[PDB]
From Swiss-Prot, chains A, B:
Protein name per UniProt: Selenide, water dikinase
Cofactor-binding details, from the entry: Binds 1 Mg(2+) ion per monomer.
Organism lineage: Eukaryota, Discoba, Euglenozoa, Kinetoplastea, Metakinetoplastina
GO CC annotation, single: cytoplasm
One annotated GO biological process: selenocysteine biosynthetic process
Sample GO molecular function, one term: metal ion binding
EC number: 2.7.9.3
Gene expressing this chain: SPS2
Subunit text: Homodimer.
Binding site for ATP: D24, D47, G98, G99, Q100, T101
Name of the top EC class for this enzyme: transferase
Family the entry assigns: Belongs to the selenophosphate synthase 1 family. Class I subfamily.
Keyword line: ATP-binding, Kinase, Magnesium, Metal-binding, Nucleotide-binding, Selenium, Transferase
Binding site for Mg(2+): D1, D47, D205
Length: 323, 323
């Protein structure tokens, strides 16, 4: 979800230009600060990528530096976050050209991403979605579980000893956490670049509301305003980190992963296509150019019957695709 | 100070386009929340106006809502800040099209302002400034003093009773505070609109570093990078709220108003012109279109001799223009 603003300028051919901007933030764990920065930047860019815009013109970095650390610790942490944020901006072929850092009792890492585009250079997230369309997800789910288990290694909770220790090893937790953070810092840029090519009908990114929450918002957005559609996103199968699923079952689905509401940070794109043929071709080209990272067809869009505010559903007995 | 980013688009005539963006924030006092919002927005726009860009394409609002207040108080405060912020955006002929609100122990009100412009639609803040140029300031100084005296009426400090009470009345303090907040919520938009018309050589806005701090940064900026100039901004006379000056003298210049380092929020533009004739014409047209708000010629630019990092100075025995 971005802001899309018509400008009082056209391009060289007299075509309308638009300023597309987005902002986001995340609360980092006590962890590798360079990595925090990378995830912070990928999270900001993710929203722009969901508009089918692979080229970001510039970024602003917004950072809250914690008053808890001593000067030495705070200085190196801030420096490393900045470096990691900038490293992802370089990978995105953009630059960080401004922003601000403030002292604050709680840390925060976020920013703003902006692109100036013509209509031909984006894919609008409303107005294209139809019943029958096929849904694909470009990153696996379960990062909230991953981050919390890793946290418990350095600063344990009673739940860790009660339900986790002895059943899921520090090595399996290390591997889950590495898979999750590797996935989180990855850009959705290649996905954005391929959306138009395969006739995508729009996308949303998956962040703090979980797969089902963001699916719901994507569906609900089609019901505003002047030319509404009444649609329901049906999730039939979902890619989830295997160890995150195992951990969830040991903790009575504490983080609501299996319910569809577990928070992701810098999650994947949930993209719609007009057919399975189109969706499969997008997935095939995406894995081939983006380092062999799989994507998954996860369901379809149907006509909405229905309960107020409900525009997405998890199918009863949906398939879990263990990753 | 903004970010100015060349875009891979031209306008209808094949002229280069640039994305100019800026961000800023302020820590609001316990006060009228609608007014907090208005000052917050004017503060964000001020930086864009300093680039001679009177038309803002869009704004994002970034707000930190305090965890200190109870739900009822927080909800109405947040609502009123939002309304005040939006009211100034309407006055600026722009819209707030996105942003974010976060819970936080400390309140903050800020945002982002963006414009897409050609070279002909802005005035760059480096590269035009010359020795001999005349400096003008478009809002009076002393808001930090004003805000703190008003604060002491509802939540007193020992300094208030020691040095203020009995010498500066609650009515004089009310008047100083009203003058200061009236000035702070005013947009620098008309100033921006008139800069090019009179051949301005760039501007900076005046915010948290005080008149001398921002003058210094404006001068120092000319020394980077490929085509540097060595210049010194000389401040010869300064407009200051009369009561703020009186209060300063009672408190041994506590807030450094007389030293030139008192923090302003949403202060005026410090603008350079090639001559006194040009400067006077700008001032005359600005007061005529912007509700009769005075502006002042405050000094000039000279060749820099000098101490490292020093690119501005207050003249010994400079004139205080009481407002």
């Amino acid at each position: 979800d971005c802001s899309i603003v018509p400008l009082h300028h056209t391009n060289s051919k007299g075509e309308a230009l638009f300023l597309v901007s987005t902002t986001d933030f995340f609360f980092p764990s006590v962890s590798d600060p360079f990595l925090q920065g990378q995830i912070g930047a990928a999270n900001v860019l993710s929203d722009l990528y969901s508009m089918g815009i692979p080229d970001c013109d510039t970024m602003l970095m917004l950072l809250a530096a914690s008053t808890e650390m001593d000067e030495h610790e705070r200085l190196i942490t801030t420096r490393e976050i900045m470096k990691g944020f900038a490293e992802r901006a370089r990978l995105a072929t953009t630059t960080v050209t401004g922003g601000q850092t403030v002292m604050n009792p709680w840390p925060l890492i976020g920013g703003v991403a902006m692109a100036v585009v013509s209509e031909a250079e984006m894919v609008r997230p409303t107005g294209l979605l139809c019943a029958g369309d096929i849904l694909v997800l470009t990153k696996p789910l379960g990062c909230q579980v991953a981050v919390n288990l890793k946290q418990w290694l350095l600063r344990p909770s009673p739940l860790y000893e009660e339900a986790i220790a002895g059943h899921i090893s520090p090595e399996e937790i290390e591997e889950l956490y590495n898979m999750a953070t590797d996935s989180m810092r990855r850009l959705n840029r290649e996905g954005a670049r391929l959306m138009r090519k395969h006739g995508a009908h729009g996308a949303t990114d998956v962040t703090g509301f979980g797969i089902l929450g963001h699916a719901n918002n994507f569906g609900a957005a089609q019901a505003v305003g002047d030319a509404p559609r009444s649609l329901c996103l049906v999730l039939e199968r979902l890619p989830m980190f295997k160890t995150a699923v195992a951990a969830s079952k040991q903790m009575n689905d504490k983080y609501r992963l299996l319910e569809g509401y577990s928070a992701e940070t810098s999650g994947g794109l949930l993209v719609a296509f007009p057919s399975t043929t189109a969706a499969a071709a997008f997935c095939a080209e995406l894995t081939a150019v983006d380092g062999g990272c799989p994507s998954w067809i996860v369901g379809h869009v149907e006509d909405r019957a229905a309960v107020d505010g409900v525009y997405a559903r998890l199918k009863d007995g949906y398939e879990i695709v263990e990753v």
